Subunit: 264 residues, 4 copies
């Protein structure tokens, strides 16, 4: 009986279903797949990418950038929600092909640098090509590109380095406060007495409160279904989207129920 | 008028004054200099080093280990308070010469990896040879070597990755709770509205409360004068040592006064 | 039509077929699988591992070390032939579980650090958990553990960092010169005018001559079939093994034929 | 008697003497100091920097780029001769302030990543802020920016990763072959039987032959005096410059004399 073969990270088909750019605000565009968010922000001094999706999405992202008039060398910065394979997947290839820099907090930087391996909960089950962060970000630090200011808000739990990003765009010149909040799920995590993450419960509980207080007129999430976006229906995509409060409340109720189940 | 020459990091002579090993408890020894702490813990399965001091102290540390019967290959693990040049200085050389591993949190790992350069407050003024952390530690995580359990307690402020370490030794078989608490100083830091560390004040304030609640019968600090140790007087070294409460209280009063001065 | 799913690196079953330790010489043991070499060298000051095989072989290797009386903390050093997933696969996990250091040349170190990704020929098709090299080795440099001296011989081609290792063991006290020579295959490589490896042909040709001149009484290779070893037949495993000259000659004839085919 | 204080890397004043940009060819400019080369190549798609000089030269380089009409974000790529502090000094700061990428061979990448520490000959005596290489280059590989093609030629000896760069510029539309050849000095090196560089002599001897055969109408070197440039005399700076043959011949004669002295 030989040792088992390695298994690939397979995902639902809708995560891999390309879509054309969908405008979110004057400078902000969804350019990922129907079920994975990847936000392009276009400024007068270059573009910013927030998340990339799965590793095989690199070519799709570059195609959608080209549709927006963004050449590979116009991509200045890549920001991340968290460094799991389904959001940071293509970062290594994008850096090689664009010359962009990556900015991340220390926790995200170290997980990105090992390609998602030795994950606190998944081990080596979900890996991707490693990448190096070029700028280390602190909680509340402001990153500016072309006059648009992105503020980082640390929200540990789903990963130690999970981060929300806020910025103000316009909608026909009128200001709109966008919040790109990270996942608050704990998929199959051991929550209580986890030797690799002893303070996991306390971090999640603080993070629910962080998300509740974000300045936000429009909430988006790395998995669009988590904030009730439907990228497939085009102009009506944001009709049913949740507020920050409703997203945090829904996430905390699932968390408390999962914690009670684990206890029992 | 040419550009200025580079300047070396020069320190008080007492920081560089070697001393013979001083026993702290049954398994725990101070083996650094009169004014820089470096703790050796000897177990049945190898030795642990907490801090190393300045870069030029590598040979002294190895000599003092040899006096304790610890061969270079018996050093299993290096733990750190924080990754400034006067505590993590010799880590790169010690790893090369012993085969030890380094364990650190993500913040300390990334600062260690750039040799203290691009420091949030010191820039490139105080650098040292870079080293890589082999094990990333989470807050409250327990590291065990030879049955002795070290628990990490994150106390950000002096650096983002500043860490206290606690363990229980014996004194002639009777248990003694040791706390190696990091610095709580802010030497020349901009505290308020610092763009590189927006939440510095909140982190320090939480850290004062963390240090107050450490389980501790005997407090030690990377700079021994900060907890009123006097390594030079041998057996009487710990006579005047502060409690955790007194150390945190004294540190917070200096912090509040410095913050009021900066305001004015 | 969605993007393709990621594909796992699947290998022949015999590569994953565990075997008990097979003695090669007084201090040297094959402890990998029937079709992947992993050599354990036991000295008076600890053990050395040369190669590890596939990522999922970490537990098997630790089990076979335990059968030899080698505890996890007795493993001092890991050396590599080359940093493809089928030889460096488990290195990251072995370092975490043993405290060993890894020594490698600069080329191997950088490929190991990206987990085999962005391979000059395979792209991201064959990746594994990244690891960091602790000691960088130069051509002809001698690494000594417990009195046993390993000499590195660079033989670029299969990877830029491909390395042969030589050492002298005994067979009942009588000296035997062992050569662990790396692969000389070019599986599906573009050899001529390769933009990522412009001097590939010149490097292979020099490497054939390097292997021919190795001091060698007993040749072993990362893939045992390449030097006509048969690990499955126990005591007769080395009966048909090739000399260094015959291995290099056979490899060069395959290389020249492949190069003529590519031309045509 | 305390341990010695750390010593700073001090250099001759002329190495730190700023100068205004000096045109070398239609697209190529010397923008470093009177005694340290730093070449700016301006293309239609951004600028390339070859070497930076000492760590404290970062601000000067950015000022001289601005005089040439090159904004910080127009700097696309940094190439290096070798990763000693007097040529790679400011690379870390330049990357942070420009968003440029660094391309280097594996040897140079690993020395750059440790900030020049653990140098084969200098130990930790001459360090600088570490930086990460973003693109790894192979011997003979071509790097293209804005249509201008740079070819790497490995010339190990002064460091293992020492590299010459060649490209074709114009002088009023007429082609001129430029060679930026690395140092061939061995300042205070142990050449024979060096345990850290066993094949040093063979590498130098091959490198002399590599430099002799470079395609070259105009030779430049990281230290301008080595190829008889005089940056201080402006238009006459290149009057007495050596050919590639004369530079290699002069370097080999010094090398042979130094080797005979070491023997005696
Ligand atoms: Zn996730
Ligand atoms: Zn996800
Ligand atoms: Zn400090
Ligand atoms: Zn200090
Ligand atoms: Zn291979
Ligand atoms: Zn193989
Ligand atoms: Zn040099
Ligand atoms: Zn130089």
């Amino acid at each position: 009986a030989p040792l088992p073969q390695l298994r690939a990270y397979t995902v639902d088909a809708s995560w891999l279903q390309p879509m054309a750019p969908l405008q979110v605000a004057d400078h902000t565009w969804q350019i990922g797949t129907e079920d994975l968010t990847a936000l392009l922000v276009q400024t007068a001094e270059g573009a910013v990418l927030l998340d990339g999706g799965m590793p095989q999405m690199a070519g799709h992202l570059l195609d959608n950038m080209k549709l927006r008039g963004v050449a590979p060398q116009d991509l200045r910065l890549i920001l991340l929600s968290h460094a799991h394979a389904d959001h940071a997947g293509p970062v290594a290839e994008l850096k090689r092909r664009t010359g962009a820099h990556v900015a991340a907090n220390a926790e995200t930087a170290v997980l990105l640098a090992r390609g998602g391996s030795n994950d606190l909960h998944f081990g080596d089950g979900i890996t991707y090509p490693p990448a190096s962060a070029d700028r280390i970000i602190m909680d509340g630090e402001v990153v500016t590109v072309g006059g648009i200011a992105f503020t980082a808000h640390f929200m540990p739990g789903h990963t130690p380095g999970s981060t929300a990003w806020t910025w103000t765009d316009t909608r026909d010149g009128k200001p709109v406060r966008i919040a790109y909040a990270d996942s608050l799920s704990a998929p199959g995590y051991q929550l209580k007495g986890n030797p690799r993450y002893p303070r996991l419960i306390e971090d999640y509980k603080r993070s629910f409160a962080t998300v509740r207080a974000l300045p936000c007129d429009l909430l988006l999430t790395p998995h669009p279904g988590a904030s009730n976006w439907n990228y497939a229906v085009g102009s009506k995509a944001s009709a049913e989207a949740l507020t920050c409060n409703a997203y945090a409340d829904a996430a905390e109720k699932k968390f408390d129920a999962q914690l009670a189940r684990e206890t029992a």
